[PDB]
Amino acid sequence: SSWWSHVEMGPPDPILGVTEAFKRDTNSKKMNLGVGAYRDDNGKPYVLNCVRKAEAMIAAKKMDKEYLPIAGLADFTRASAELALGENSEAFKSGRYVTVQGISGTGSLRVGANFLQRFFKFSRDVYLPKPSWGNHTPIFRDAGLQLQAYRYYDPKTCSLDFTGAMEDISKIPEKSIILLHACAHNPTGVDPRQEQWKELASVVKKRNLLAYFDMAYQGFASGDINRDAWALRHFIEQGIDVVLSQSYAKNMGLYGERAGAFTVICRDAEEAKRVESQLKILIRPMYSNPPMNGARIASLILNTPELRKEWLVEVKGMADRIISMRTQLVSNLKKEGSSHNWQHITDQIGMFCFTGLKPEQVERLTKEFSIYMTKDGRISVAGVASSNVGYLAHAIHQVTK
Amino acid sequence: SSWWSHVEMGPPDPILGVTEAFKRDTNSKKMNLGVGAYRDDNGKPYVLNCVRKAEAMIAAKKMDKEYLPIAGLADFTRASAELALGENSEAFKSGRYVTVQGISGTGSLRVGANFLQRFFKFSRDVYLPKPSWGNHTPIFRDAGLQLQAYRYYDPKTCSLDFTGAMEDISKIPEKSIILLHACAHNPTGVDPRQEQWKELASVVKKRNLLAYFDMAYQGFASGDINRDAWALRHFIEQGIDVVLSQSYAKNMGLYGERAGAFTVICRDAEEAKRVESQLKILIRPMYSNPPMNGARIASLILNTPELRKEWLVEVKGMADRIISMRTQLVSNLKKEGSSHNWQHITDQIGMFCFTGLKPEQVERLTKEFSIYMTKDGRISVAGVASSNVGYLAHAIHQVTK
Ligand SMILES: Cc1[nH+]cc(COP(=O)(O)O)c(/C=N/C(CC(=O)O)C(=O)O)c1O
Numbered sequence: 001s002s003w004w005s006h007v008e009m010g011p012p013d014p015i016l017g018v019t020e021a022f023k024r025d026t027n028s029k030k031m032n033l034g035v036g037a038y039r040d041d042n043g044k045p046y047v048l049n050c051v052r053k054a055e056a057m058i059a060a061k062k063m064d065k066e067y068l069p070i071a072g073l074a075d076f077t078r079a080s081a082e083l084a085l086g087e088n089s090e091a092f093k094s095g096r097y098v099t100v101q102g103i104s105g106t107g108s109l110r111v112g113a114n115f116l117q118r119f120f121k122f123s124r125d126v127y128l129p130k131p132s133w134g135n136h137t138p139i140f141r142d143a144g145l146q147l148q149a150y151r152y153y154d155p156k157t158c159s160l161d162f163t164g165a166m167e168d169i170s171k172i173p174e175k176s177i178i179l180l181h182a183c184a185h186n187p188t189g190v191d192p193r194q195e196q197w198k199e200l201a202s203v204v205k206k207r208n209l210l211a212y213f214d215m216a217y218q219g220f221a222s223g224d225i226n227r228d229a230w231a232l233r234h235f236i237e238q239g240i241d242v243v244l245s246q247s248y249a250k251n252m253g254l255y256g257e258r259a260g261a262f263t264v265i266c267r268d269a270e271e272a273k274r275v276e277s278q279l280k281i282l283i284r285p286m287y288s289n290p291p292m293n294g295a296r297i298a299s300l301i302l303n304t305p306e307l308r309k310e311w312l313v314e315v316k317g318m319a320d321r322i323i324s325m326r327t328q329l330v331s332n333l334k335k336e337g338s339s340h341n342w343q344h345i346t347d348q349i350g351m352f353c354f355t356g357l358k359p360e361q362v363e364r365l366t367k368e369f370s371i372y373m374t375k376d377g378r379i380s381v382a383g384v385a386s387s388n389v390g391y392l393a394h395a396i397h398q399v400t401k
Numbered sequence: 402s403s404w405w406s407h408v409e410m411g412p413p414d415p416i417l418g419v420t421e422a423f424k425r426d427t428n429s430k431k432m433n434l435g436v437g438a439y440r441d442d443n444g445k446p447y448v449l450n451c452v453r454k455a456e457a458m459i460a461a462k463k464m465d466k467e468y469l470p471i472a473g474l475a476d477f478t479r480a481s482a483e484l485a486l487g488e489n490s491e492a493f494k495s496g497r498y499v500t501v502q503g504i505s506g507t508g509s510l511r512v513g514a515n516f517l518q519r520f521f522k523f524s525r526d527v528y529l530p531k532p533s534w535g536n537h538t539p540i541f542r543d544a545g546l547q548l549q550a551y552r553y554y555d556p557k558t559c560s561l562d563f564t565g566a567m568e569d570i571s572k573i574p575e576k577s578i579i580l581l582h583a584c585a586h587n588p589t590g591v592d593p594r595q596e597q598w599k600e601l602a603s604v605v606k607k608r609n610l611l612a613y614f615d616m617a618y619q620g621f622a623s624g625d626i627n628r629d630a631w632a633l634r635h636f637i638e639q640g641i642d643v644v645l646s647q648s649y650a651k652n653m654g655l656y657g658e659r660a661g662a663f664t665v666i667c668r669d670a671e672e673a674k675r676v677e678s679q680l681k682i683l684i685r686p687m688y689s690n691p692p693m694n695g696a697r698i699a700s701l702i703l704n705t706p707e708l709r710k711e712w713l714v715e716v717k718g719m720a721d722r723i724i725s726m727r728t729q730l731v732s733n734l735k736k737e738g739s740s741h742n743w744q745h746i747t748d749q750i751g752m753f754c755f756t757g758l759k760p761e762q763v764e765r766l767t768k769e770f771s772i773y774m775t776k777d778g779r780i781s782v783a784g785v786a787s788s789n790v791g792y793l794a795h796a797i798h799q800v801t802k
């Protein structure tokens with residue numbers, strides 16, 4: 001009878017745990033399609049070209065390793081806001097925002113959730129869409145907020161349930177908090193259409209809800225950054241002051257470096273100052289100050305003209321390749337002789353495909369084929385290469401035949 | 402009347418804020434002695450030699466940037482435990498521990514505090530020593546625990562108040578939590594003597610308190626790592642299962658990289674497994690996974706024989722230099738003609754000196770001399786160089802004369 005005799009065996013993460021299990025398999029044909037991690041055409045981890053150069057520049061300058069301010073590297077912070085907001089933005093121009101370096105997308109999301117728990121005096125409820133990324137639940141839950149839901153996906157039709165979305169949203173009590181995915185909804189891969197977004201704007205405005213945007217995929221939904229930041233920007237110019245979280249984990253392939261940011265759109269630059277003051281005070285007793293490596297790299301990329309442009313060609317290429325795997329998947333499916341309609345695969349955007357397979361099929365997939373994916377039918381098509389798209393298709397077919 | 406009109410201007414950090422103010426001064430003779438950051442003999446930031454080499458090795462191998470497990474880089478984790486515990490340790494040998502990468506010392510401390518808040522069913526009180534590092538308060542406080550105190554320093558005598566310490570400790574209710582600094586107490590620079598430590602052990606054992614060790618300075622108290630880990634190790638071999646937090650920020654000069662670790666000494670290796678399981682689940686909705694750069698560097702250093710030995714000569718050198726600045730400070734003081742007894746300066750160990758100056762003197766120091774330090778009289782003697790020890794001494798003298 002020690003201190004921890006009562007502490008039970010908790011279970012492995014529904015997403016991250018997939019990597020653990022996959023690591024242990026001895027099947028040489030094994031594929032890891034759980035976590036959304038981009039792979040090159042050879043099925044290998046990919047460090048962008050522009051990253052490798054930023055690194056080299058950092059190297060040559062012999063930089064120190066001194067602590068960074070509590071709010072992060074200034075230049076990285078100003079650059080992320082600019083990247084979300086667009087340079088011509090009044091909010092940006094006018095200085096009505098505060099952006100603070102965060103521990104990637106998760107980190108930022110949690111700093112924001114914590115901030116809210118502490119200063120958002122009007123409500124303890126966060127409305128997530130059905131379905132949403134597994135991690136959103138616990139991030140909000142450990143921060144001290146309550147979780148709610150709004151209809152989103154319609155599995156019958158493999159699409160956005162606009163009517164239910166609007167119904168639900170039109171009834172959320174005023175002054176509540178709503179989480180919206182900026183683009184490339186995870187895990188459905190289905191986004192609202194522009195016109196649809198204009199409509200959502202109205203209701204949010206109308207009901208006076210705090211819009212919380214999660215932007216983990218800028219440049220992966222269409223291959224264009226500005227285009228992918230459309231909705232977010234439209235909300236702001238309609239007069240909706242949102243809170244926003246950013247990740248550079250996927251779009252810059254900086255996964256383990258942990259670079260990201262959390263932003264608040266305020267009334268003036270004076271309000272922005274006070275908010276800043278309080279966010280610092282939250283972060284201090286959390287981790288004191290943030291990791292410098294991913295922030296140093298990103299800043300250099302974003303702030304260096306040639307590096308920025310190279311990066312944009314690189315994002316396009318990754319997005320394109322994903323499209324090619326989608327196409328090929330479907331086609332092989334037919335070739336294998338599938339009866340089913342696999343149109344959703346090519347219809348969805350981003351890193352994944354919300355396939356539809358049941359959990360018994362997921363089980364067989366891993367066991368007979370050593371293909372690892374999440375139990376909800378989600379697969380990371382980003383981790384598929386030209387050499388194993390055939391293998392994938394064949395399996396999908398066998399277990400579905 | 403927006404969302405954040407009620408959010409007030411919070412104040413700057415008592416320690417980190419010193420750097421902000423110092424940055425803004427235009428006096429060319431300015432010195433930053435607030436935060437404990439080591440400076441070379443030229444008053445410049447110092448990236449150890451072994452760090453620069455680890456980096457190069459990382460570079461050449463073309464490593465990826467894939468996400469790391471939720472618990473961190475295995476090799477870094479096993480190596481930190483080994484570093485605290487000593488290779489011959491039964492706890493280490495027997496596998497009764499769990500170590501998890503954390504966001505430096507602060508990060509680890511907070512993961513531990515959070516763990517405790519969640520699983521330490523016997524008490525909500527943490528006993529800090531008087532005085533203790535400013536940040537300990539809020540880290541424990543935001544995690545959800547209550548703060549208590551035990552006598553420690555005696556400003557009359559510039560030393561450890563052993564009698565008060567023991568009194569206080571002998572009365573802490575059983576099953577409470579006590580925070581002890583492993584070595585180089587911050588900010589007093591005064592540690593218990595070995596015999597004193599044996600005595601403390603007994604009472605802790607005796608009262609059945611959870612000992613929480615904060616080890617931010619291994620190798621800075623004496624210049625020897627094993628020697629500096631003595632107390633921690635003695636507690637464990639007496640049968641006290643402690644929780645421990647480590648930072649590699651100072652001893653390896655990895656400040657902004659954010660490398661650190663949190664460890665739990667359990668009953669068996671099976672308990673260790675369950676604890677692990679639960680810690681992962683806490684970290685997941687916090688920041689998902691930890692930064693890789695500082696962990697990659699440290700692992701290489703610790704796990705590579707020649708690198709490890711070089712590192713140990715390097716720690717010795719830094720510790721030695723500090724000693725030389727102490728000596729010189731005192732001596733110049735006399736030369737300037739101080740009447741006061743500045744013996745505490747050479748008596749204390751570690752990065753600082755708990756000088757004794759009052760806040761009016763601290764004020765003048767910054768204003769007439771541009772010498773920045775914390776308001777409690779603490780100065781970072783580590784940030785002093787041969788070229789400005791005279792300048793420092795003279796000021797100290799003027800404002801004290
Ligand atoms: C919507 C969303 N938000 C935040 C994140 C967190 O990213 P990061 O910067 O690494 O903390 C991710 C990552 N998505 C996945 C990775 C994961 O589960 O950690 C995924 O679905 O695989 C998201 O898909």
Ligand SMILES: Cc1[nH+]cc(COP(=O)(O)O)c(/C=N/C(CC(=O)O)C(=O)O)c1O
Pocket residue numbers: 287288416417435436437438504505506507508534536582587615617648649650656661
């Ligand atoms: C006792 C102690 N514990 C934990 C830490 C945190 O270290 P890190 O790995 O950077 O989170 C520090 C740093 N000490 C100082 C730095 C600070 O205040 O952030 C100091 O007293 O200057 C400590 O002195």
